[PDB]
Amino acid sequence: TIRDEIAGCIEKAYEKILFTEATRILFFNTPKKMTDYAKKRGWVLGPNNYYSFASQQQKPTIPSTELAKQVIEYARQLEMIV
Amino acid sequence: FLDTVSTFTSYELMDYKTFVTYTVYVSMIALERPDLREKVIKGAEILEVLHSLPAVRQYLFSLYECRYSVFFQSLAVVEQEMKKDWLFAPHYRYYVREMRIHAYSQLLESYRSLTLGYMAEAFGVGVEFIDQELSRFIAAGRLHCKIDKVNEIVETNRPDSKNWQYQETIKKGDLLLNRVQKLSRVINM
Amino acid sequence: AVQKVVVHPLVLLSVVDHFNRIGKVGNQKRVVGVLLGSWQKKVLDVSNSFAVPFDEDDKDDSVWFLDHDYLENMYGMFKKVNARERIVGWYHTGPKLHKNDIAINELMKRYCPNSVLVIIDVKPKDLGLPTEAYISVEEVHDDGTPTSKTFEHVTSEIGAEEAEEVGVEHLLRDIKDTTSQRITNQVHGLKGLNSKLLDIRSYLEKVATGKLPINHQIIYQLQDVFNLLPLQEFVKAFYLKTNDQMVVVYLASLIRSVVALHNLINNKIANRDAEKKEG
Amino acid sequence: YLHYSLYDQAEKLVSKSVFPEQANNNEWARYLYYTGRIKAIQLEYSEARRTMTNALRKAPQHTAVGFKQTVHKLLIVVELLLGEIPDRLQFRQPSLKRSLMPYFLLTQAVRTGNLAKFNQVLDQFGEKFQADGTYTLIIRLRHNVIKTGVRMISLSYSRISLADIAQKLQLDSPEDAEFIVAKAIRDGVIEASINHEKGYVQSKEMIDIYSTREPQLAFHQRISFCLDIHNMSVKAMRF
Amino acid sequence: ILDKKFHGILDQGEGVLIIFDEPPVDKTYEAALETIQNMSKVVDSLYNKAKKLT
Amino acid sequence: MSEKKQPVDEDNWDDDNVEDDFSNQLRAEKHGYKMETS
Amino acid sequence: RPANHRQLTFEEIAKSAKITVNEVELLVMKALSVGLVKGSIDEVDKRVHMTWVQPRVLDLQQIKGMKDRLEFWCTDVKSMEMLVEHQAHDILT
H or E segment and range at residue B132: helix B128-139
Beta strands in D45-198 (DSSP E): 193-194
CA dist., res. C247 & res. C249, Å (int): 6
Chain C residues in contact with D235 (beta carbon < 8 A): none
Q: How far is CA D71 from the centre of its chain?
A: 16
In chain D, which ranges are E strands? 193-194, 201-202
Which residue type, as a one-letter code, is found at position C30? Answer: R
**Cα B23 → chain centroid:** 15
Alpha carbon of D92 to those of A64, D66, D71, G14, G81: distances in Å? 49, 9, 12, 80, 61
| CA–CA separation, B134 and D156 (whole Å) | 9
Residue of B59, B49, B71, B34 whose CA lies nearest to B3: B49
A80/G87 Cβ within 8 A: no
Which of A48, D233, E20, D99 shows the shortest CA–CA distance to C262? D233
A8 Cβ under 8 Å from any chain C Cβ: no
Query: Nearest to residue C117, comparing CAs of C132, C127, C129?
Result: C132
CA-wise closest residue to G10 among G43, G34, G53, G38:
G43
Extended strands (E) in D180-233: 193-194, 201-202
Q: For residue A66, which amino acid is it?
A: E
Experimental method: cryo-EM
CB atoms within 10 A of CB B5: 7
Cβ of B180 and E1 within 8 Å? no
Q: Where are the beta strands (DSSP E) in chain G?
A: 7-8, 48-49
Q: Can you tell me the distance from the alpha carbon of D185 to that of D167, in angstroms, rounded to the nearest whole number?
A: 20
> Going by beta carbons, is chain C in contact with chain G, meaning 3 or more pairs sit under 8 Å apart?
yes
Cβ-Cβ contacts under 8 Å between B and D: the total is 55
Q: Say which DSSP state A6 is in.
A: H
Q: How far is A71 from chain G (nearest CA, A)?
A: 9
DSSP B53: -
Question: Which chain B residues in 72-91 lie under 8 Å from chain F, judged by CB atoms?
Answer: 76, 79, 83, 87, 90-91
Cβ(C52)–Cβ(C35) below 8 Å: no
| A72: contact with C, CB 8 A cutoff | no
Smallest Cα distance from G20 to chain C, Å? 29
Deposited resolution, Å: 5.7
Long-range contacts of B47-56 (CB under 8 A, 24+ apart): B49/B16, B49/B17, B49/B20, B50/B20, B50/B24, B52/B17, B52/B20, B53/B17, B53/B20, B53/B21, B56/B21, B56/B24, B56/B28
Residue among D22, C193, A12, D90 at smallest CA distance from G72: C193
Q: What DSSP assignment string belongs to A22-80?
A: HHHHS-SSS-HHHHHHHTTTT-EEETTEEESSSSSS------SHHHHHHHHHHHHHHSS
Greatest CA separation for chain A: 71
Contact status, residue C81 vs residue C105, Cβ threshold 8 Å:
no
E43 contacts: CB under 8 Å, gap ≥ 6 = B176
Query: Which is nearest to B61 in space by CA: B77, B35, B27, B37?
Result: B37
What letter represents residue A19's amino acid? F
Residues D183, A70: C-beta atoms closer than 8 Å: no
Task: Classify the phi-psi angles of E32: left when phi > 0, otherwise alpha if psi is within -120 to 50, otherwise beta.
Answer: alpha
Task: Give chain G's length.
Answer: 93
Neighbours of C (≥3 Cβ pairs closer than 8 A)? A, B, D, E, G
The phi and psi torsions of C140 (rounded to 5 degrees) equal -55, -65
* Pairwise CA distance, residues B21 & B27, whole Å: 10
Q: Is C97 helix (H, G, I), strand (E, B) or coil?
A: coil
Residue type, B94: Y
CB contact under 8 A, D64 and F23: no
F30: contact with B, CB 8 A cutoff = no
Measuring CA to CA, which residue among D28, D70, D26, D78 is closest to residue D52? D78
Q: In angstroms, what CA-CA distances link D203 with D167, D185, D193, E24? A: 18, 12, 5, 36
- The residue among G85, G87, G90 with the most chain A CBs within 10 A of its CB, best to mutate, is G87
- Is E38 within 8 Å of C261 when comparing Cβ atoms? yes
Amino acid at F30: K
d(CA A23, CA A18): 9
Three-state DSSP at D58 gives: coil
In this structure, which amino acid lies at residue D136?
T
| Residue of chain C with shortest Cα separation from G51 | C228
Between CA G85 and CA G88 the distance in angstroms is 5
Q: Do B125 and F12 touch (CB under 8 A)?
A: no
- The residues, any chain, with a CB within 8 Å of residue D45's CB and separated by 6 or more, are D78, D81, D82
Contact B116, D137 (CB under 8 A): no
Distance CA B164, CA B171 (A): 9
In degrees, rounded to 5, the angle at the alpha carbon of residue G50 between the alpha carbons of residues G49 and G53 is 150
